[PDB]
Amino acid sequence: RTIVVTTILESPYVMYKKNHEQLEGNERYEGYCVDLAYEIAKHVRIKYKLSIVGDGKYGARDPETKIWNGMVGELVYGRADIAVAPLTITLVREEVIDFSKPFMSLGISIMIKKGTPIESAEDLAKQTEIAYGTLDSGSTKEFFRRSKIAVYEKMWSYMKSAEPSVFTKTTADGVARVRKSKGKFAFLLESTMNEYIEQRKPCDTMKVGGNLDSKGYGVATPKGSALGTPVNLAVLKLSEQGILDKLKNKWWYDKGEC
Amino acid sequence: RTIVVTTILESPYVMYKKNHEQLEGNERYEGYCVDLAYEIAKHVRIKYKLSIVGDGKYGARDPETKIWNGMVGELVYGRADIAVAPLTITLVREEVIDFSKPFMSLGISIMIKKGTPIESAEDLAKQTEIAYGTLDSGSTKEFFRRSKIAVYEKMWSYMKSAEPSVFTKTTADGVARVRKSKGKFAFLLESTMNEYIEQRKPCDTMKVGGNLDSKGYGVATPKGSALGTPVNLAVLKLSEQGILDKLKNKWWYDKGEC
Ligand SMILES: C=C(C)[C@H]1CN[C@H](C(=O)O)[C@H]1CC(=O)O
Ligand SMILES: C=C(C)[C@H]1CN[C@H](C(=O)O)[C@H]1CC(=O)O
Ligand SMILES: [Zn+2]
Ligand SMILES: [Zn+2]
């Protein structure tokens, strides 16, 4: 009856409210994906509880054990009914779960500390003074690992071998490292997170260049689920009523500090 | 065995080749969607024939007869196996056919003759010296007809009553009218077509402002079809190998005359 909605902490998708320790259930959280889940559940007519995925991951299949981890795995093993999170719609994920049409459009992009002499991936690639890396795991690393475009192969090889490690564990950590490296570290991350950070104090970062690819986040459900279709139509309706635009503006720009 | 792929003439998606009258079958045509259909059919492993939809329409349901027209209707009535066209992924369409994940991202946008004093929808809305309209039918008209955002309601009402008619029958006609109206007509059309035209002689138009919405084109198949899933994974794979980016650059920018 009460559906399980798996999600994950990632600003401004899902964040603890100010006095979350005094709160219970869904009231503990706020953010874009909290509002989205509310709006979706309103259209599909379901009661639900948000659960933070236990292992803090998005969804990948271990090559050895073949187990899917993260929110994807919660869905694959039947421990959750829906995942509402900045979950990149990728082929390997689409093979084992169902994604709604994108609720947000995005692309891989470059974050620099203001003043860094870099405008594009090409600038990064033809040098090593300024180091650069992606998150340790996730779709961006995967984009680079799999590319057959020369510029991107060049970048993957560099990152793959760079010492010490150019990869970071979280968005926060990548941002901290740009911010501390005095212009000697650029972070490669989804354009959505990049744009959000740009609008946050100390306002010392910026997104430069166009995106490297074009993709989307989708709401995910287990294959064969009876919520699959209604959730899909819910996203499209929300997109069409301008609610997805309204929410993005709310969480990214209305609150903008720069 | 040989699957029917319904499509439609619309530059640079599908166009007659130079000597099409001397050619047969699929060889008559070229463009982005011709290349896409080739690439998809290669991954899904099917032989196919491109058929130009008979009634020159995309897909809407007549309110009186309840018949679906256009490429959508070819799919709904079983006369075609797949539609590969700049077919906007919309809720009313998604209710009766299956769309792949978007192969192209886009939004409603503004086309002006160079020099026109207009930067945004707001500028258009607060005046009448410069007339403006959309295609007679299609998803853009529908966006305006259904909006509950004030600026857009204002624009729909104006367009709805403007004399003579601000609506045009085709992309070509809308472009011609901008081009001839000496800065007194702006055309509201999908950002994809807008960007393509901007790169064509006489180079006297331009896209101004951001887009009014965010959506995509999807490849469409009948509900319950066994090609639905493989086509969906085909688009994602192509997106992921950078083939959709390569094709867009090919048909929009490589050939750019401005
Ligand atoms: C925040 C993380 C780790 C997620 C969010 N979208 C990607 C995902 O769905 O894999 C990841 C980021 C990226 O790989 O840059
Ligand atoms: C070219 C046309 C009439 C099509 C293409 N995409 C929209 C569709 O799928 O409805 C239409 C354009 C638009 O309404 O501005
Ligand atoms: Zn706390
Ligand atoms: Zn001809």
Side-chain angles (χ1 to χ4, degrees), chain A residues 10 58 86-88 93 135 138-140 190 193 217:
Chain A
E10 179 65 22
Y58 280 79
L87 190 56
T88 302
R93 294 180 176 151
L135 288 166
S139 62
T140 303
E190 294 177 332
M193 276 71 164
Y217 301 142

Side-chain angles (χ1 to χ4, degrees), chain A residues 91 94 99 101 232 240, chain B residues 90-91 94 99 101 232 240:
Chain A
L91 166 80
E94 181 69 300
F99 277 112
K101 295 292 184 306
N232 187 55
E240 280 175 15
Chain B
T90 62
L91 166 80
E94 181 69 300
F99 277 112
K101 295 292 184 306
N232 187 55
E240 280 175 15

Side-chain angles (χ1 to χ4, degrees), chain A residues 5-111:
Chain A
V5 182
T6 184
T7 193
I8 191 160
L9 296 189
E10 179 65 22
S11 294
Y13 303 98
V14 191
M15 301 183 289
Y16 280 128
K17 259 189 242 172
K18 196 171 72 63
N19 41 176
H20 70 111
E21 296 188 35
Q22 294 175 283
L23 300 174
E24 296 208 40
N26 295 356
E27 305 293 330
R28 292 171 284 178
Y29 315 103
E30 67 183 358
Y32 179 96
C33 283
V34 179
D35 286 354
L36 181 58
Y38 176 85
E39 294 289 341
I40 296 181
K42 171 188 290 176
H43 281 299
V44 171
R45 291 166 190 202
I46 45 156
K47 300 177 319 299
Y48 61 103
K49 265 173 302 174
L50 306 164
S51 331
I52 307 303
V53 60
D55 74 354
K57 306 164 172 304
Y58 280 79
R61 197 182 70 144
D62 181 300
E64 202 47 46
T65 69
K66 315 298 203 76
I67 298 168
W68 279 89
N69 67 26
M71 296 181 277
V72 176
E74 297 302 292
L75 293 174
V76 167
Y77 304 111
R79 294 186 289 278
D81 299 300
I82 309 174
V84 181
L87 190 56
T88 302
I89 295 172
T90 62
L91 166 80
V92 291
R93 294 180 176 151
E94 181 69 300
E95 287 168 348
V96 300
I97 47 138
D98 278 346
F99 277 112
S100 77
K101 295 292 184 306
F103 64 81
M104 201 172 276
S105 291
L106 61 117
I108 292 169
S109 69
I110 299 161
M111 177 190 291

